[PDB]
Every structure is written in structure tokens, then in C-alpha cells.
Write a protein that binds this ligand. Structure first.
Ligand SMILES: CC(=O)N[C@H]1[C@H]([C@H](O)[C@H](O)CO)O[C@@](O)(C(=O)O)C[C@@H]1O
Length: 659
């Protein structure tokens, strides 16, 4: 199947190029596919990569185009003046702008298929949207088309939406090419920056909350939320997926499901993005959410995550019950048997379920992965699948039998409906993992567990104390161990307001650590401890970041090499009052007095491009790895998008900019 027109290396600065002679009436059926490999010299303004129009006076609403906005949105219009049909199909955060001071080459495409009445858009190997529209228009359906141009749309004799950049290759086909063909044709260097991809070995269409960590042996390890029912925090099904690289981030393993429940199948779901429909959630599967990684002194790796029973949201989790009882000085996870109103049971030694009323063992036991047995035999429940089609979400028992689990809605014995924290450990640097351990009720018996601050933990150098950042909604909770992770304690620090205080730590000098965190006031806060985390200062605030009141997670790390003769820290955060946008990486140099000279920054892409949760690591070669949400993950307009969490590498010289 061959193009009706192909052009190469057309450099434009807003004025466009007429190709009317070379396209006139070639779109015989009216269907079309246009594949455009381009880079932009300037991202400002609404820019059309091509335009097919009626250029006559009064016919300015008779055109087809593919467009780019200054926030990375890719779209198309197909409009006819006399029928008054105006189609616009798009997705935010579809393209890249610039990377390391150079324009990025993207390959995008549009397919219009009259038989299906769908428009489809592709960007860098991903079909970003396909939408069926009742008012479908093909080229033949638009009256009096007389002008075909590159890099603009001719409207009433004037060039609209002028493109600034180079069309490296543009191909026009007079038919609807098939999806696999167009995915391949749009695949390029940008595609290779995705570690996790929609419907890869995780089965998830969507991801959020990336974490990077470099282990002592040189392995670069990642974890992430695989969020199956769109990108909603809750209600959803979420697993923690992992992937690693043993060549300094150049190649990565096929993702694995590392923390996952099986009450719901991990399946690819087409979550709706329309107003209204996008608020849809599933009934809720048992969930792991928001991972934290640390490597211990002995090279064992710990991963922590929040644990939510099926159907329980952060918002409805009870705050007044830990889910534990204390019996004879020991903390045991408590259970309510279906039909009871009280929690009459506890999981004691060897997972044996005791009746607390009689203080005797029952026939039931719970294994280390939370599965329920009766008389030594597993109880089972039927797994749920979720499906769509006719714009209708259906959940149903799917014929698969899985072990009954205390976190599931169909369990005979159930935990308190609140949030918990679990950790797992690995002795082979992430290739295999232990069973989970739930944290004991370190906040007290009558409080829920803290919520983890996604990213990493640290080992403070002078004491060997392990620190894990978390928060409660009104306090900071610095979880810690002084016995190399055998047992855990917490320092609870009240905050000026009800911050979602996702935090990360850095060590300035031995015994001196700072916790940088999200607030509800627009600023990034930092608290300082001079006794390895036992006591903390009042908050201070970075002066150079100004964000919206909701705030965003951040990443900050220590860096191992001197910069300008000084020890350095590296910070990643959005910096915009208009959304989760304008990502920056900042270098902070530690002064002799333990203040920080925030001397350099580098903008990640253009300032209106999306940038939400992020994670930094120092690669073994002392380059910097970054993985981030390249979209606004707060915005109700950017929910449920595929293939938007990339990985990029920087040298320090790429970062040492702007002073
Ligand atoms: C892709 C897009 O947004 N297109 C819309 C444009 C632009 O918003 C403005 O021209 C600002 O550039 O405005 C219209 O009023 C127009 O020109 O007819 C409606 C059209 O659908």
C-alpha cells in the first residue's frame, strides 16, 4: 500500500507550503491516513502539520487538519461549513517538545475510516486515541475542498495555524491503514524511553508513581503502580510492577507483577475519557499502591507499599482502627467473620486464627500471602473480570478460582477496612522476593497506618538508621529502624496544615538530614534533623518553586560526585501555578554551614508540557536517571492516558544550566 504523496525535509517558519497540485482530488474514497515525522523549532501557538480545506471566503469551517499545542496535545479537526459538523478528536500529552536543549523528532499519524466512522491518532508508536463520531466527515464529505497544504490550514485565503519546524517525512495515503501498520510506522527513538507500556507483561493499560533506585552491584531497578481501571487512585485495582537494567539504563527487563492481588484479573481496560464517563471506577479490587525502595547495609533490598482491601478508598478508610488487637503484649492482625458485627478473631503464631472470645485456635489459618485455609486446605473464591463495550462497564465472576484472601470482598474472614503498609525483601537484588510483612500498628491501636511517600528510603550514615518517609494527612511520619530492619518505629511530627506530605530524605552531613515534602500551600517544605531523625525543626520552604495548593510528589537524592567542589543534591519537581507542568531538575550544593546553594536548574521539556510524579537515581556511571509522569496527573482532562511515564538519562553537564 503506497502513498499518494510523500515529501521529505520541508523546513517551515509559519508560512506553510502549497501542495494542492500534488494532492488535488487524489482522495478518491474520502478516507485518509497521514503519517508525519517532524520536529518543532518553536512550540508556541496552535500549529497544523497539514491542512486540507475549502479556502474560499465564508468556508473557513471546511477543513481537515492534524494539530499540535504548546502542552504536547495532539489532535485533529474535520469540519464542514454547510452541514455544520465540527469534529475534534485529541489526547493531551501525546508528543515531546524538546530534550536536552534540542527539538525532539516525533512521528504522528491520523487515520479516518468511513466504514467504522472513527478517527484515530498515533504518536511515537502509541495509538493515543480512537473515537467513533456520529457526525463523521471524510474528505469527500467536506464541500468544495480546493487547497491542500503543509504546515498550515488555508482559511479564507489566509494561512492559519502556521507550523514552525521541519517535516522530516510526510506521507499521505488515500485509505485507512490498519492499526499495527501505523503503530510500526510511528515507532521511533521516543518509543524506546518507555519502560512500562500499555498491555505489556503487566496486563495494565495505565501506570503511575514511578520509582528508580540504583543498587550497590550496579543494577538500576524500577517499580511503578500498574493501575488497571484508568489512572484513578481509588477505587481501582493497582499492583506494583517492577523492571530492571544491568547496563546503566540502556535496556530493561520485561515488567513483572511484584506486589499483586488476584481477586481481580490484571487486564487491559479501555477506560473512558469523556466528561462524566472518566469519573467511572470499578467496585474496587484489593490494592497495592505507592512504592518505596531501599537497599540495606547488607545488600538486602526492601520494597514497601500501601495495602488497601478491596473496595476501600483512602477517603473512606477508617482512621480510628489499626486493624490490630493487643493480646498478652503482642500485636495480632484482627479479623471479622462474615455475619459477625465484632472482630472476634486474631491471626496468631503460625498464622493460626484464634477465637478471641475463647482464646483457642479455630480450624482456620492464614498463610504468609494472606490466603485462608480451613483444616489445612485452601478456601477459594471466584476472580472478577471487568469489561466494556457498548459504553457499559460490567464486572463479573470470570471462571478462575483463586485463594480466598483476607483483603478480598468475598472473604469469610476480613480485615478492618483501612490502609496498611507491607514490605517485602529480596536477597538477589530484585529477581525474587519474600512474602509480605504488614507493619505492626506503630501509630497506635486506634489509628490507621501512615501513607508512604513514594520514592526511596535512606540509611543515615553515622548511626545506620533506616528511614522510610510517610504521612498521615496532618503529620509527617518518619518510619525508622535502628536494628537493620528487624523492627520498626516512628517519629510523628505535626504539620502547620493538612499537607499530603509525601517526602524524600537527603543527608547533608553525618547525623544531619532533611525531609523535603509536598504541602497544601503551593511551596515545597523541608524539615531538618541534626540527630539522625530523632527530632525535627519547624518547616522551611524553597523560595524558587511555586505550585498550586494541591501540590505534587517530588524526588530528591544525594549525588556521589563533587559539583563545583561541593557535595550536591538533585531535586526533581514541577514548578507552575497553572498545573502539574514545567518540570525542573535542580542542583543544590551543600554549604559548609549545611544550607544549600540552589545554583543550577534544567527544564525538562517546554514549560506548558505536563510533569507530575517523578523519581531520580544516580546511575553507576554517575549519570542521572529520571522517570516521570509526562502529563498532569491531577487534571481531570488528562486521566486514563496510555504510555506517558518515560525514562530519560542526563549527564551532569546537561543539568548544570541557568547560572
Ligand atoms: C484546534 C482548535 O482549538 N480549533 C479551534 C480554533 C482555535 O481554538 C483558535 O483558532 C485559536 O487558535 O478556534 C475556532 O474558533 C476556529 O478557529 O474556528 C474553533 C476551532 O475548533
Amino acid at each position: 500500500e503506497t502513498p499518494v504523496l510523500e515529501k521529505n525535509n520541508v523546513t517551515l517558519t509559519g508560512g506553510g507550503e502549497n501542495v494542492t497540485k500534488e494532492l488535488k482530488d487524489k482522495f478518491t474514497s474520502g478516507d485518509f491516513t497521514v503519517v508525519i515525522k517532524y520536529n518543532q523549532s518553536s512550540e508556541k501557538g496552535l500549529q497544523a502539520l497539514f491542512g486540507i480545506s475549502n479556502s474560499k471566503p465564508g468556508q473557513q469551517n471546511s477543513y481537515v487538519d492534524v494539530f499540535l499545542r504548546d502542552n504536547g496535545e495532539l489532535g485533529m479537526e474535520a469540519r464542514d461549513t454547510s452541514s455544520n459538523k465540527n469534529n475534534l478528536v485529541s489526547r493531551p500529552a501525546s508528543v515531546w517538545g524538546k530534550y536536552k536543549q534540542e527539538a525532539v523528532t516525533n512521528t504522528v499519524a491520523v487515520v479516518a475510516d468511513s466504514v467504522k466512522k472513527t478517527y484515530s491518532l498515533y504518536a511515537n508508536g502509541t495509538k493515543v486515541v480512537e473515537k467513533k463520531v456520529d457526525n463523521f466527515l471524510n474528505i469527500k464529505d467536506i464541500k468544495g475542498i480546493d487547497y491542500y497544504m503543509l504546515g498550515g490550514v488555508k482559511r479564507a485565503g489566509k494561512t492559519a495555524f502556521g507550523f514552525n519546524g521541519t517535516l522530516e517525512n510526510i506521507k499521505f495515503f488515500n485509505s485507512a491503514l490498519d492499526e499495527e501498520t501505523v503503530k510500526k510506522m510511528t515507532t521511533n527513538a521516543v518509543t524506546g524511553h518507555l519502560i512500562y507500556t500499555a498491555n505489556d507483561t503487566t496486563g495494565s493499560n495505565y501506570f503511575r508513581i514511578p520509582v528508580l533506585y540504583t543498587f550497590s552491584n550496579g543494577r538500576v531497578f524500577s517499580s511503578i503502580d500498574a493501575r488497571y481501571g484508568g489512572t484513578h487512585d481509588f477505587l481501582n485495582k493497582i499492583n506494583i510492577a517492577t523492571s530492571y537494567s544491568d547496563d546503566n539504563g540502556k535496556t530493561w527487563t520485561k515488567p513483572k507483577l511484584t506486589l499483586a492481588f488476584d481477586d481481580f484479573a490484571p487486564v487491559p481496560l479501555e477506560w473512558p475519557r469523556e466528561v462524566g464517563g472518566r469519573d467511572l471506577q470499578i467496585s474496587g479490587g484489593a490494592t497495592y499502591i505507592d512504592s518505596v525502595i531501599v537497599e540495606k547495609k547488607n545488600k538486602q533490598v526492601l520494597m514497601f507499599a500501601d495495602v488497601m482491601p478491596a473496595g476501600v478508598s483512602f477517603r473512606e478508610a477508617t482512621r480510628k482502627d489499626s486493624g490490630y488487637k493487643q493480646i498478652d503484649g503482642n500485636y495480632y492482625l484482627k479479623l471479622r467473620k462474615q455475619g459477625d458485627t465484632d472482630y472476634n478473631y486474631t491471626i496468631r503464631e503460625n498464622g493460626t486464627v484464634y477465637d478471641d472470645r475463647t482464646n483457642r485456635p479455630t480450624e482456620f489459618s492464614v498463610d504468609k500471602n494472606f490466603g485462608i485455609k480451613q483444616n489445612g486446605n485452601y478456601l477459594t473464591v471466584e476472580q472478577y473480570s471487568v469489561s466494556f463495550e457498548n459504553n457499559k462497564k460490567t464486572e463479573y465472576r470470570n471462571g478462575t478460582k483463586v485463594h480466598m484472601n483476607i483483603f478480598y470482598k468475598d472473604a469469610l474472614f476480613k480485615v478492618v477496612p483501612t490502609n496498611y503498609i507491607a514490605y517485602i525483601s529480596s536477597n538477589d537484588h530484585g529477581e525474587s522476593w519474600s512474602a509480605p510483612t504488614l507493619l505492626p500498628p506503630i501509630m497506635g491501636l486506634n489509628r490507621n497506618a501512615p501513607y508512604l511517600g513514594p520514592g526511596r528510603g535512606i540509611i543515615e550514615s553515622s548511626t545506620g538508621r533506616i528511614l522510610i518517609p510517610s504521612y498521615t494527612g496532618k503529620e509527617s511520619a518518619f518510619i525508622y529502624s535502628d536494628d537493620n530492619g528487624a523492627s520498626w518505629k516512628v517519629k510523628v511530627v505535626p504539620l502547620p496544615s493538612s499537607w499530603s506530605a509525601e517526602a524524600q530524605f537527603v543527608e547533608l552531613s553525618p547525623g544531619v538530614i532533611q525531609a523535603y515534602m509536598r504541602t497544601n500551600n503551593g511551596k515545597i517544605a523541608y524539615l531538618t534533623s541534626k540527630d539522625a531523625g530523632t527530632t525535627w525543626s519547624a518547616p522551611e520552604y524553597l523560595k524558587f518553586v511555586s505550585n498550586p495548593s494541591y501540590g505534587t510528589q517530588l524526588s530528591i537524592i544525594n549525588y556521589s560526585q563533587l559539583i563545583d567542589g561541593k557535595k550536591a543534591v538533585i531535586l526533581s519537581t514541577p514548578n507552575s501555578t497553572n498545573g502539574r507542568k514545567h518540570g525542573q531538575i535542580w542542583i543544590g550544593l551543600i554549604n559548609d554551614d549545611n544550607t544549600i546553594d540552589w545554583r543550577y536548574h534544567h527544564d525538562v521539556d517546554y514549560s506548558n508540557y505536563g510533569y507530575s510524579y517523578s523519581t531520580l537515581t544516580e546511575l553507576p556511571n554517575h549519570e542521572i536517571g529520571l522517570m516521570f509522569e509526562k502529563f498532569d496527573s491531577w487534571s481531570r482532562n488528562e486521566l486514563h492516558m496510555k504510555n506517558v511515564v518515560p525514562y530519560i538519562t542526563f549527564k551532569i553537564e546537561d543539568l548544570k544550566k541557568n547560572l
